[PDB]
Amino acid sequence: LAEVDTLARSLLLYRSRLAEYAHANPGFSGSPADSALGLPAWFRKPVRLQGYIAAGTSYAFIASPPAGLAAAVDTGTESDLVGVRRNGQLVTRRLGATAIALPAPIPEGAVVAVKEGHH
Amino acid sequence: ELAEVDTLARSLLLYRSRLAEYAHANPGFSGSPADSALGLPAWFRKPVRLQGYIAAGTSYAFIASPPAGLAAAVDTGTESDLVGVRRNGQLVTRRLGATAIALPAPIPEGAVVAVKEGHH
């Protein structure tokens, strides 16, 4: 039924070389070009799959996105954050307070890095 | 003049990843494994208060009451990675709610978005 999966992978594939481009283009903010990016050659980027480096920080997006894709993308990525317990919410600079389920043992005020894992 | 809580932040990140991956290679678990599992390096002498947990197959590593410059130093060595739909002024990710961001202008409403902080 659902192989918006290959479309999810294309966006993440695309977000990766976007990030690697930033690493060597400091102080930039763009849509780099598809030449300059280094993408497979055999990979043909669905116009509608866009990108932007801003201050530094890759954003890859799909503006009129097929239902199923939100899910397909979230699932092929992990997610990785840093902050401090306050209170029950994760407090992270540059990102405001995020409310994750903070397991029982992390004290208020601790420093905390989080990471998820696919399927 | 200078602290290398940066060594400590690095040890945290390093411990974290040993949980990340054991967490996978051992599905259905809720921490809080002892470091004999994990398979940590010979040389590494974990300093409690470096604590770790798992909840869902997601893991956390945490210093229970922090030293100073440690959040920063750690946020730095990480990067950061979210995905979610743009509801406007916001990035809605259905496990961490709506996370409010500096979201570029050209990314318009309702767009699905993968975000990979460039740690600089």
Ligand code: NI
């Ligand atoms: Ni670097």
Ligand code: NI
């Ligand atoms: Ni897997």
